[PDB]
Amino acid sequence: KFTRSRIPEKVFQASPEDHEKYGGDPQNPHKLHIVTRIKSTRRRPYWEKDIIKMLGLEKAHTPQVHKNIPSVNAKLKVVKHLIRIKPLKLPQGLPAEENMSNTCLKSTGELVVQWHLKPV
Amino acid sequence: SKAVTRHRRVMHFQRQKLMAVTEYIPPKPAIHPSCLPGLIRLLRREIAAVFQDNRMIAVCQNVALSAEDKLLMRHQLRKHKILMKVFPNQVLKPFLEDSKYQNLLPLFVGHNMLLVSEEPKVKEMVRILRTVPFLPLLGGCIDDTILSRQGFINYSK
Amino acid sequence: RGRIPGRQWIGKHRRPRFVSLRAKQNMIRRLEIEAENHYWLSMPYMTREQERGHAAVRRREAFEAIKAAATSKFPPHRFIADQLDHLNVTKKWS
Amino acid sequence: TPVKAGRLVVEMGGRCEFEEVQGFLDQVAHKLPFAAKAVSRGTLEKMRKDQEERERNNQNPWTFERIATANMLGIRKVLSPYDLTHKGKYWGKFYMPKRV
Amino acid sequence: GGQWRLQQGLAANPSGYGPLTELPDWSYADGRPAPPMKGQLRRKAERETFARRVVLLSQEMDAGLQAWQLRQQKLQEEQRKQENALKPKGAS
RNA sequence: ACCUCGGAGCAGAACCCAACCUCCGAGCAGUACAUGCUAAGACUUCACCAGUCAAAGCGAACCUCAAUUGAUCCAAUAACUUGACCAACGGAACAAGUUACCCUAGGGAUAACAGCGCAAUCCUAUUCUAGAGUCCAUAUCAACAAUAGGGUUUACGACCUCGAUGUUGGAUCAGGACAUCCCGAUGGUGCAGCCGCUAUUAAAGGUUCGUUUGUUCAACGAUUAAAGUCCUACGUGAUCUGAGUUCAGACCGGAGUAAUCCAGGUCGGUUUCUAUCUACUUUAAAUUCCUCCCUGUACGAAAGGACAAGAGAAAUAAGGCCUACUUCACAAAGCGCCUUCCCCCGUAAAUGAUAUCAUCUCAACUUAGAUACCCACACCCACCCAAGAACAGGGUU
RNA sequence: UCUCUUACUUUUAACCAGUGAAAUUGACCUGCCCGUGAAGAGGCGGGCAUAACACAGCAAGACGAGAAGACCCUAUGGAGCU
RNA sequence: CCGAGCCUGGUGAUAGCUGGUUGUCCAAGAUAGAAUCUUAGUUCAACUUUAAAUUUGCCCACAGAACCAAAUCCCCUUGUAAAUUUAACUGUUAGUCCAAAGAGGAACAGCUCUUUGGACACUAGGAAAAAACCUUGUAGAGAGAGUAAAAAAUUUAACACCCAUAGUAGGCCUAAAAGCAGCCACCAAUUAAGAAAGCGUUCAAGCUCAACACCCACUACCUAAAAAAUCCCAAACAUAUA
RNA sequence: ACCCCUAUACCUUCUGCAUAAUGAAUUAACUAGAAAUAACUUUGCAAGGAGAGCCAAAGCUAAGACCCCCGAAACCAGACGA
Numbered sequence A: 001k002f003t004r005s006r007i008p009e010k011v012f013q014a015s016p017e018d019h020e021k022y023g024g025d026p027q028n029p030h031k032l033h034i035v036t037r038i039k040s041t042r043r044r045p046y047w048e049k050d051i052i053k054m055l056g057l058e059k060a061h062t063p064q065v066h067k068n069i070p071s072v073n074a075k076l077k078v079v080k081h082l083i084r085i086k087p088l089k090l091p092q093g094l095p096a097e098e099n100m101s102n103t104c105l106k107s108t109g110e111l112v113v114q115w116h117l118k119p120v
Numbered sequence B: 001s002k003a004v005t006r007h008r009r010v011m012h013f014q015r016q017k018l019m020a021v022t023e024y025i026p027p028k029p030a031i032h033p034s035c036l037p038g039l040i041r042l043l044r045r046e047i048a049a050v051f052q053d054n055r056m057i058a059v060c061q062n063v064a065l066s067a068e069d070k071l072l073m074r075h076q077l078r079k080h081k082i083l084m085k086v087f088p089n090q091v092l093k094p095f096l097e098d099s100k101y102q103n104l105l106p107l108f109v110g111h112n113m114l115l116v117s118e119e120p121k122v123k124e125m126v127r128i129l130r131t132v133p134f135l136p137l138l139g140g141c142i143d144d145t146i147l148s149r150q151g152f153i154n155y156s157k
Numbered sequence C: 001r002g003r004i005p006g007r008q009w010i011g012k013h014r015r016p017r018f019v020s021l022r023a024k025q026n027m028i029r030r031l032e033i034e035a036e037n038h039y040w041l042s043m044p045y046m047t048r049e050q051e052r053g054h055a056a057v058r059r060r061e062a063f064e065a066i067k068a069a070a071t072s073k074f075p076p077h078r079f080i081a082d083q084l085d086h087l088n089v090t091k092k093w094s
Numbered sequence D: 001t002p003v004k005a006g007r008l009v010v011e012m013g014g015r016c017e018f019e020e021v022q023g024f025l026d027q028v029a030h031k032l033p034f035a036a037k038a039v040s041r042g043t044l045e046k047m048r049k050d051q052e053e054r055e056r057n058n059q060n061p062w063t064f065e066r067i068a069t070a071n072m073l074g075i076r077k078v079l080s081p082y083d084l085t086h087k088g089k090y091w092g093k094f095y096m097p098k099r100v
Numbered sequence E: 001g002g003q004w005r006l007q008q009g010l011a012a013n014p015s016g017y018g019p020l021t022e023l024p025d026w027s028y029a030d031g032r033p034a035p036p037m038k039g040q041l042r043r044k045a046e047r048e049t050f051a052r053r054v055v056l057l058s059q060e061m062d063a064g065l066q067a068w069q070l071r072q073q074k075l076q077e078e079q080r081k082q083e084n085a086l087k088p089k090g091a092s
Numbered sequence F: 001a002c003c004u005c006g007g008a009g010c011a012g013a014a015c016c017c018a019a020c021c022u023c024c025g026a027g028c029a030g031u032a033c034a035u036g037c038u039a040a041g042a043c044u045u046c047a048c049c050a051g052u053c054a055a056a057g058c059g060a061a062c063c064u065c066a067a068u069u070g071a072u073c074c075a076a077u078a079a080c081u082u083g084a085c086c087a088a089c090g091g092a093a094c095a096a097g098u099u100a101c102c103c104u105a106g107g108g109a110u111a112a113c114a115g116c117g118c119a120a121u122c123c124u125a126u127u128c129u130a131g132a133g134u135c136c137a138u139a140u141c142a143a144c145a146a147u148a149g150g151g152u153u154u155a156c157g158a159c160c161u162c163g164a165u166g167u168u169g170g171a172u173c174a175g176g177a178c179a180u181c182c183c184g185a186u187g188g189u190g191c192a193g194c195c196g197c198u199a200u201u202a203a204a205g206g207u208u209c210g211u212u213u214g215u216u217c218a219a220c221g222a223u224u225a226a227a228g229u230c231c232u233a234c235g236u237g238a239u240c241u242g243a244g245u246u247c248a249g250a251c252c253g254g255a256g257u258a259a260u261c262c263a264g265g266u267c268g269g270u271u272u273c274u275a276u277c278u279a280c281u282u283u284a285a286a287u288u289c290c291u292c293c294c295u296g297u298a299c300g301a302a303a304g305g306a307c308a309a310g311a312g313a314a315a316u317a318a319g320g321c322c323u324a325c326u327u328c329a330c331a332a333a334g335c336g337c338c339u340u341c342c343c344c345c346g347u348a349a350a351u352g353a354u355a356u357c358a359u360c361u362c363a364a365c366u367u368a369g370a371u372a373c374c375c376a377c378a379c380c381c382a383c384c385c386a387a388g389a390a391c392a393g394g395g396u397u
Numbered sequence G: 001u002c003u004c005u006u007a008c009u010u011u012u013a014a015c016c017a018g019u020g021a022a023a024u025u026g027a028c029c030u031g032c033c034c035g036u037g038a039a040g041a042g043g044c045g046g047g048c049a050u051a052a053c054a055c056a057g058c059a060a061g062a063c064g065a066g067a068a069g070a071c072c073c074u075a076u077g078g079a080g081c082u
Numbered sequence H: 001c002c003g004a005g006c007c008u009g010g011u012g013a014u015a016g017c018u019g020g021u022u023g024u025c026c027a028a029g030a031u032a033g034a035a036u037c038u039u040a041g042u043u044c045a046a047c048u049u050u051a052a053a054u055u056u057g058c059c060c061a062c063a064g065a066a067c068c069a070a071a072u073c074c075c076c077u078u079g080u081a082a083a084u085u086u087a088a089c090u091g092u093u094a095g096u097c098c099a100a101a102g103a104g105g106a107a108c109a110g111c112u113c114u115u116u117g118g119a120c121a122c123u124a125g126g127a128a129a130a131a132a133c134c135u136u137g138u139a140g141a142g143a144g145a146g147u148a149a150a151a152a153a154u155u156u157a158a159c160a161c162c163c164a165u166a167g168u169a170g171g172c173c174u175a176a177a178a179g180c181a182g183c184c185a186c187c188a189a190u191u192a193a194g195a196a197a198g199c200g201u202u203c204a205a206g207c208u209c210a211a212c213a214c215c216c217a218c219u220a221c222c223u224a225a226a227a228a229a230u231c232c233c234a235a236a237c238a239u240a241u242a
Numbered sequence I: 001a002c003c004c005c006u007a008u009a010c011c012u013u014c015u016g017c018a019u020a021a022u023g024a025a026u027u028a029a030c031u032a033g034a035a036a037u038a039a040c041u042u043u044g045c046a047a048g049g050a051g052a053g054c055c056a057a058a059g060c061u062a063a064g065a066c067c068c069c070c071g072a073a074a075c076c077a078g079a080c081g082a
């Protein structure tokens, strides 16, 4: 019979070769996740539809920021087949109140605080 | 249908795609390693015996000779006391090559036969040979001198 | 000449389907995406004990706002200007 | 009598070798209702270490076991719970020896 | 050419976040800037909303971490305050 | 056969969970006589009804069991209480058969025909080599078993159709497959010859007439070169038949109290359609037997007894035509006469490499290995015609 | 009757003139093969075919027309009979 | 149109059954079950709709749930925004395929019966047409763009050469069992041959295989079908940088 | 205008209809949702409301807003018919 899936804990135990392939640093983890929906909830269980609504990923290809906390990661682990998780990177730091109107997320996953629309 | 059928059941297409994607891929060598790069001691004692004893050694090509004929020829040479030693070439040739009567080397190809004896009773050997025309008396070497067939005949009369 | 018995893709005897290359390249692509998801969910910033209560005020206050709306339902005000304005459906020039 | 894949049906021994027994044992195996092969101790060990060598030598990043146990792409929606332990080598009563 | 554009960081759709979609379409011929376009106004509002969520989740987590710290130091304070109030006598 | 209640599995771990699913039981018994009274909080058989547990308190003392059951009204009784195998067990207070003499409303939600799915049954092929075949698995036949197909039967299912998809045989006209009955070509033989058996290839052509049965089939008579197996809505009833079968009448035996019935027999019993659309309505290469000769030759101990090559003589089919017969009579016909022309592939050999022999070769290679019809075209009013439904066509010197 | 059917006459028929119905009809610009599909296709897929339009003939199909199946099942629908 | 005439009336008989049911536009919305002369219906529940009131509802973590597998229950965080209750009702209560766990049947069915979950009775793209498989869902205009699913691959069977005398017709056993019907032993001579592995003899006799020699060297790919009925079925193509 | 590309009439019925399931030639006219108990909304007045009767521990008075059409075989009464 078709049920929910308990994913073994080993899958989320990462290897050093995994680190060099996807450069991320085990010490100093990244804080915020850019999650985008890249597959449908049709032809899928109702509980996976409920999690996509809870995570706010009802529209496909629209990026959402979430916390890299153990509770959110548990939900993203029931919908990991219908999404893409990238780390949110911050080159020039966190936006300020004088800078909140000139931000852009970019496909690299990098919230830049100064968008100018001018060649470098 | 039930999970266990008498026939191979048709899978779901996603399971088919899963099987195709998870097929086994063998390791491929880069430069193809195909393209990349006993009784002989006893027999050595016996050849050392036929060469460090009997003074007369005679090589004859081992012609087919049906059993009765092989046996009869042997009893006659036994009378004049001559031994019919049939020893393999793959042990015999390199021994000749390093034990110095190496001029018998281009002679021991094909089927061969050693007629040896301390007594050089070559005349009786000859009488026999000529009774059987299809036998050569290839050659040999008496008193450590390499001789041809005609030399054997000369040192016979 | 070749008819599949019954309906083609259901039943005991189906029309056989085979996997092309692009079908496999599509499945392989979705597999690499899911593996990168497995890694970025392998380094939790916080621990459960460290996040035990860090959002309680925001969540409680949001539910208090929802209660505020669902409690503040009531019929709208009525106006004598709205009632007396209907008299203008007979406003002639002269 | 129910027989599963990997069970010895008959065993023979004595002052004989595998060729001698292998002739009529392959005959009987062929007439058996499932797939069956005449095997020796050495050939059984060689088959098992060949399967282990193939599993270790596989150059495909994607295995049935990995995808199934991780529910990669939501594939448990087309799989069976017994496939988590069968690992794609068994499909009903049929064993597939070429799967790793 | 979506994968190539992603490899250069320039979105995947050329109608996404670049100058070709975000610069003004026109201006008055004398040179006055045109009023802002409606889609660009909606995009800037949504980008503000995203950035404001980035600041909040960071500062909610960055506040929860220090709260956990300031709780464990109090627990270790009430574990290190172990002075025996009266003095041992008896078989000593 | 079952219909209510309980335990176990299916239903492995909170609950729940179906089948004319697999098993086992119940329709009580025993004790007590506070088996009194009362009252928080709960459970609950997926609703309701009904069912279950219970602290504290008053009063005393100092229930086992799994199911072991039955509502309302009404009846009985002074009262407390007590009444259904109401077992179709949520129970109508009390009502059976039969209908082909039948009727109505519906149903392809559901059977009979046909189609479709399926292949248990049925049929075929291969693999395996026990066994039979004097000996010898493999000339021939073949067990236990395995692998595949086929879709002719009997079934199973209930998916189209019950505001109709008419039926068994037969007639007529047949289209197709080949798993070949005959005619062709070939390989094996437990092939001397004549006959056979068996396998490969072949679907151009052909595949009889009768007695009985309604009959498919079957038996029998006489033939034949042979008297194929199937599919086609068990091909084909707006082409036919109606013996059977399938309404109303009747008889025999049987069943039933009878009405009436029998998956038994028997006699009788209305077969409509003026064609709108689709499609179709003249596409010249024939097969087979027999006789003589080869020849009493080959072959064979004999008895028996060929194949080629050659000549004729028919039969059928296709096309045509009246000279004479015959039906007849300016003509149409057959019972009469005339004509009728290619191959066909399974294999068997030579040379010769891979693999310096050999080897027919998914090696390069060599050999066995159509013509004829038709064909010009505003003389046309009209007349004639061997031309013709009309129209067209031929002739009119 | 049939082997085995042929000939002629009359009716019908066809053409001309007069008169002039009926069932039927969602709309049709209404082809063949294989496949598909509510499981048997003019209309769907792949192929093929294909200027237009009368008259005569035919009955393979339009699950052809007719008759809200006579058979079977159902209905807390009828009726006759015992 | 007599299994019971016809006409009028009661009569607008009754019909859990078929058929029918008339302007525009938006929105929410798919069915666990129990009773029932009931299963072609109804009533209650559930689900669905509207309006009100209030506070939590879903997802979830340690701890926790019995003796004789996948999972669930419970559940704070957290991510979210729903839930319960009150009032008022209708309609649905004749279900199909796919994946999975089972059951019945033939480990038959487009078969039947449950359960968990899809999808369909809603849109669009794909899988030839196409319900139920895959991609994808919230609607308009555009002669812009990036994508999603998405196109079947396979072709098989050559295998040596050369040689062979003999203790004995080992014994027993037998009519005879001579390497070879069966039994016991399995030595032994030659450079090198089993008291013989297969074949063949009534038994004999025979010819192969294992052994000599010989020599380049055992060359050694370890695999395997075919059938039906109107007419095969896209046309084609091995070689220009994913 | 055609040619090119795309596109399986409608209604009913159903698990599911291009269906070869139902109905329909077409035009014009005719031809099918009736009301209570409550609830809700909006006025009036308010411990009372209503033009006797009745309700009332915020009610009472008034209004608005919701419940189809055709069809049997039958049964009975009285006449009319040999």
Ligand SMILES: C[NH+](C)c1cc(NC(=O)CNC(C)(C)C)c(O)c2c1C[C@H]1C[C@H]3[C@H]([NH+](C)C)C(O)=C(C(N)=O)C(=O)[C@@]3(O)C(O)=C1C2=O
Binding pocket: F246, F247, F248, G070, G071
């Ligand atoms: C055609 N015939 C053989 C027939 C057959 C059946 N049915 C069967 O026998 C069963 N057939 C099945 C099983 C359904 C395939 C039949 O059922 C009938 C009939 C005949 C009819 C005659 C009817 C007729 N009317 C309607 C024109 C008539 O004039 C009379 C009459 N007596 O006046 C009838 O009897 C008649 O109505 C009638 O009863 C018939 C059938 O019942």
Ligand SMILES: [Mg+2]
Binding pocket: C004, C005, C006, C007, C008
């Ligand atoms: Mg089909």
Ligand SMILES: [Mg+2]
Binding pocket: D029, D030, D031, D032, D033, D034, D035, F146
């Ligand atoms: Mg087998």
Ligand SMILES: [Mg+2]
Binding pocket: F044
């Ligand atoms: Mg309850």
Ligand SMILES: [Mg+2]
Binding pocket: none
């Ligand atoms: Mg107590």
Ligand SMILES: [Mg+2]
Binding pocket: F088
């Ligand atoms: Mg009952």
Ligand SMILES: [Mg+2]
Binding pocket: none
């Ligand atoms: Mg009951």
Ligand SMILES: [Mg+2]
Binding pocket: F100
């Ligand atoms: Mg009768």
Ligand SMILES: [Mg+2]
Binding pocket: F108, F158, F159
């Ligand atoms: Mg049906």
Ligand SMILES: [Mg+2]
Binding pocket: none
């Ligand atoms: Mg049938």
Ligand SMILES: [Mg+2]
Binding pocket: none
């Ligand atoms: Mg035998």
Ligand SMILES: [Mg+2]
Binding pocket: F118, F156, H108, H109
């Ligand atoms: Mg069946």
Ligand SMILES: [Mg+2]
Binding pocket: none
């Ligand atoms: Mg059914």
Ligand SMILES: [Mg+2]
Binding pocket: F161, F162
């Ligand atoms: Mg019918």
Ligand SMILES: [Mg+2]
Binding pocket: none
């Ligand atoms: Mg009809």
Ligand SMILES: [Mg+2]
Binding pocket: none
């Ligand atoms: Mg054939």
